[PDB]
Each structure stands twice: as C-alpha cells, then as structure tokens.
C-alpha cells in the first residue's frame, strides 16, 4: 500500500 | 482532488508548468522538524541558536520559507494591536570575494533587510552614516566602520522584537582566512543573539557540521536541527520515498501519467534521497515535455536531463561525511553516563 | 657475569651519581625528533610533525603562538 | 503554600508560563553564594576583581540579576536624599568581529550604559565628541579614540561611583591577536578599575580561567568565587538535587503534579547538576504540555526537549578541565608551608 | 526526607 501525502 | 486539477489540462503549457512550481509536499521528514521547529522558536528556553543541518536538496531554503510565512500570519493578529514589530527577518549569507568573509556586507545586508516597514515608523539608530532617505531606501557611507554598524543592528531588533533571525548559507561564515578561529565567528554570532534577545537560525549544508559544540556555552545554548536524506537501508524510508514519488507523479500536470514508481531505484540513484533535487529533475523532465507538448514521459527524457554520476559520487561522499558526525548510539549515552558518576 | 659484575661495582665503587632515572622525564629525552628540532605553532592547527599536526591546550596561549618549540 | 497557587489553575497558558518563568529556586549552593557574594559586595577590603567561574547554566546571570535587585533597595532609601550616585551598573562583554578585542567598543557600551540616570544631571566628560543629544541617548563620535574614551568613562566612574561594575560574558576579553598577552588585557582593566576605585566582578564560564593567577597584582588583587554546580559523587549534592526536583515539581503549575524524583538520573545525565539547564529544560516541558494541552508531565515530552549526547559531553569535558583547576587540598596546602617555610 | 526549597 502507497500512502498520499497532501500540499504543505 | 487527490490529482492534479483537471482545469489545468485547459490551460496553456506555462501554467501548468507554474503550478509545478508552487506545489510543495509534505513529507514525514519535513512535518516533524516542522513541529520541533515550531516548538523551539515558540519556547527556546534561553537558547541562543538553531542549527538546522541537512542536504543538498531536502529543502532547507523551503523549510524556512514555509516557517516565515507560518509565523508572519501567527503574529499578524500579534500585529494587530503591536506595532513597530516584524515577526520574521532572515538574511542569506554572501561568500566572500577575498580569503576571508565580510562582516561589514552582513551588518549591512541586514540593517537593509530588516528595515523595510511602512515609511510611518521613524526609528532612530545610534550612528549618523547609516539614514533613512526619503524615498525610502536606507542608506550606509561605505566609511562607517563595523562596530559601528553592529551597534545599530543591535538597537534596531531590540526595537522591532523578532522571534527568530534565520540566515541562509550559514557555512559561508567558514570562509576565515588561514589561521582565524573558527569559534570567533560563532562568538560573535552569539554575542549579538545574546543581547538582542533573538534567536538565530542557521540554515546550511553539512559544511556547517564545522560549528558544533565547539564550547560548553556554544553547547548548551544551541538547538541541533538535522533534516536527513531517505535511505534505503530502511524499509519505512523506502516506503515514503516511494509514497513521495507517487505523489509527485500523480500531480505531474500531464494528460498521461507515467510510472515514476517504476524507475525507482534510477530516481534514488539521480537524487540520493533528496526530494529537492528529484523536483528538480521532475521539472526539467517536465519542461522538455511541455515544450515537446507531449503527454506521455518517458526514460529518455529522464536521461537527457539527469545529473552526472560523477556530481551523485559527490553529494554522496559529503552526504556520508555530515550523517557519520551527528550519529547516536546506546553506547555514548552509557558512557556518559558512566563518566558522570551514574553507570 | 653478575659475579664480575657484583664484584667490579664494589671495587669502584656503584656511582650512584651518574644513574638514570627511568622516569617520564627520561622516556621524553629518549624520543626522537626532526631534522630542524622545532616546529611552528600554528593558530587553530598546532605542530606539523611527519605530516600530521598536533594540538595541545597550552597551545591556545598566545605566548607561544606562532613561535618555533 | 509550597507550591504554586490554586488561583493559576483558571488562567491561560500565557500566564503559567510567565509565572514558571518567573520563578527562581534557592538551591543551598545558591544561597551560600549569594551569600558571600553579598558580604563582599558591602565590604571589598582593597579587592579590585571579583570573577565568577561556573558551568554554562549554573545560574550566574540570575545570582548577578538578584545582587543589583538587592542593591536598589540597599540604596533606594539612602537614595531618596542623596542624588548624581547609581548602586550597580552592569555589562557584557562583546565578541570581536575582528581577530582583536575592540577596547574602544568597551569603553563607548560603558559610558552609554553607565550615563543615563536622568536629563537633569549634567557632567563634562572633558573629551571633545561627547554629549548627549535631544533624545537623551548619550552619544560618541567616530574619531573619538581609545584614551580618550578610557578618561570619560574614568571621569563619569568616578562621579557616578556604583558598588561593583558588573562585566558578563568575561572570557570575550581573550580574543587577541599573536603577540598580544592576557596580562595586558588585565592589567589595562585592573588598571581602570584602580583608578576609579569600583570593584570590578567579572562572570562567565571556565574560559575565564585563563585570566586567573597571571601576576602576582592581579592575583592578590581578587576574591575568586566559584559557581559549582552538583555533583553526583557526594550523597548531599544528590540529595539537593532530588529536593529540588520535588520542589520544582510542587511549583509546576499543573492539575497533576509529575513525579520528577525518581527520573534524576537521566536528568542529571542531561543537566550536568546545573538548575539553570535543568529550568530551562522544565519550561520548555512545560510549554509543550500546554500548547498540546496535557493535565501532567510524562517521560516522552522529557526526551523531546532534552540536550543532544555531544552537547553534554563537551559541556562536561569543560566542566572537568574547569573543575580540576579550582580544588583545594591539603598536599598543597603543605606544599605552599614549605615553600615559604612555615612548617 | 527530602527538603522543599523557597523563592530565591
Ligand atoms: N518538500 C518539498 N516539496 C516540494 N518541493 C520541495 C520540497 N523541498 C524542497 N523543494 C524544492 O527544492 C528546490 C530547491 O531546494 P530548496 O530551495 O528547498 O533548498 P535546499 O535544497 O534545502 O537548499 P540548498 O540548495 O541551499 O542546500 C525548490 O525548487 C523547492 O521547491
Ligand atoms: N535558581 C534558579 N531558579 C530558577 N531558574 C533559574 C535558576 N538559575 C537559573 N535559572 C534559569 O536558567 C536560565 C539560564 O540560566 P542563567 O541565565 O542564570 O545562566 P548562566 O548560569 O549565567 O549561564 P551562561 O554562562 O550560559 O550565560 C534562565 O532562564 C534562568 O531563569
Ligand atoms: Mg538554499
Ligand atoms: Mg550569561
């Protein structure tokens, strides 16, 4: 499983 | 969404390359030194500097440039009812143009930094060369002699109250003629952190490594920040890398989507971990297709922009030599504890 | 060989005078040095001896700073 | 009570801090230095220095804040009729920029420090670039050089006559070039403060061991007090650092009191014995427990805001070289009887 | 026992 990260 | 908006499609090749630009990720790394960050400058304790080594590309310069603007917002309503404050004010080092570095240029870059606020405040300094001029610009006489300029800094962030100094390219202060210590500029750095009442943060590369704990007064006041590369020894590094360039992918304003996961051992290869310089490389890529109009990246235009492997041996070798420095282990902290009568 | 020995000291005599003390004083004298015989202190750096350099606390002093030790 | 009030517990975490910040402990070490501090401050006896060596965070700038707080009541009465007389002046030394030490620099922070007791009082410093402009801030020309600075500031010296100038931040004083000694340094600060008769305390960490015993002048000319933190060799210095630890915990402004007393140990492997380290340390906690809102104090947020491993072992190795020059034993005692024949 | 220190 690959997690997505978000805008910082 | 979880993509790249679909309007960027519409729009012409310049905005999609411009919002490339502006997208910044947010990687486990980059989230806890910006929560002890945050905490460290909200509370320092009497501390007096913040190192914040690193790389060559994990985004050192962004770091600071995301803390500056956090903090400018946390103290505009701070700003609200105080005046004559400025919440952040952060300076980038000059390299010297002779064998040794200039404290004049830095005394002065910083007095024409940190003096830009609206023209209603008059504040005054304590040295006639240096002078507000009328449209605005303050003006130094090259014959005003550096002491002289320090003193003024000195009253100007004690009038405006800051609550940190970041300086970019803290290693250039290193560039001492032969023979000049080495603790005499951290010295001096400290005596003007020690008055003022603000905290310096020294943003640089492992070069800076050549600045730490040099005295036990330099030691306990100082706040070591280290910002590391992913490796690939361990497998939770590899999953964010991995996760990472999903992402970067995924937002990769094209109508096609290649693979970047696929080639993952080539991207560690060509950035060494270090997310800065894999954007980098994503923006080349990117520029050639745009410029191509194509939709489809592949590994060619992935060579034909890619760093040579002389330049990785390089960044590598100086990536070794900073992370074999702040390393720790169960055995120092038995010895010094054994050391200090308590083993 | 000892018996000669024993022998020849009690004839003429131990000279306890001209003994030498195995002490660090001794283990200092026996060591060799360079060809010049002294070294600059150089600041930050120290002594440049068989291309390494070496550094001592006194050495901060700027007594001897910059001189030939 | 013995501990903080119950009134703190409706407030926000602005005023917690401010009142944990603003709290000092009486630690037996402390007290008995103050002690003596005091009793040499009212009578000097002929004594032109009076230096301050500790460990960096011992609690010498806190120990001096409280001598000028006990000076201003010990003065304020006697104050009220008598005028043109100050009871404590202070300073801090600062770190050269160059590779020698700024005398002049020195000379204009004292006499900018020192003259500013009230518009109305007037004095002519007898030195051609000196005044005081329509700010009220006393200023001193460019070209004004070092002699002549040295007899203003002996001028107002003289007139102003405080109990003791104040130098922080001491070991400044060494940064000198080759050729230059530390004995001229000294010998041109004893010779000032002679000439004016104030007794000069100097404080700062074991660098300024370098100034100590240099002549016989500057030697019999000083009352050395040393700021020693605890060490955990001797059963009582363990013990004071357990009840302060406990009374620490009673005046940690909190719903539930933490149970620091049995984690001494790691505290004293990251605090070296010194209560201003071991402050600094609790109000850091104590802030981040109440940014992050939580009722007690747990080892986690110990271990985040702790020191580094290298940090405390230069602090410590200075510590030892600094401690292993200011014993007193008997051997020597004998040594010093025979040299001069007394025994 | 453990001693509880004042204000300095
Ligand atoms: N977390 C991040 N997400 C997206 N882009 C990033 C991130 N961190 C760094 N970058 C990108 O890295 C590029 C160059 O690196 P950056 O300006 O962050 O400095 P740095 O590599 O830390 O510093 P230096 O080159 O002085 O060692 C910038 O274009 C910036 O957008
Ligand atoms: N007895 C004490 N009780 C409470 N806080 C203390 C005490 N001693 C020191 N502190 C706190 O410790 C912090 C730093 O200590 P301090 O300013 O006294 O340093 P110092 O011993 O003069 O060291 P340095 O040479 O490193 O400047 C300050 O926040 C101060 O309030
Ligand atoms: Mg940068
Ligand atoms: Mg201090």
Redesign the pocket.
Known sequence: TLVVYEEF | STGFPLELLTRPATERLAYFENYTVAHPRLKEVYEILMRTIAEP??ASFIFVYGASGVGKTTLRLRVEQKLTELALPKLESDRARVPVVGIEAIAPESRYFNWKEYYTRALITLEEPLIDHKFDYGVRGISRDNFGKINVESKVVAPALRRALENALIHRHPDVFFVDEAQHFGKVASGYKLQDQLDCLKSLANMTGILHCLLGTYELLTFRNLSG?LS??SVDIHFRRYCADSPEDVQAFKSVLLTFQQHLPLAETPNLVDHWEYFYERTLGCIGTLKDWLKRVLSDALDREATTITLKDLQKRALSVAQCQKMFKEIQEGERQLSETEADVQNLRSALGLG | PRDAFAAGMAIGGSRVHRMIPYDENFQILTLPTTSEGKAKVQVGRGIKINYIYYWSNSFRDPQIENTSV
């Open positions: 304790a009497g007064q306990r006041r």
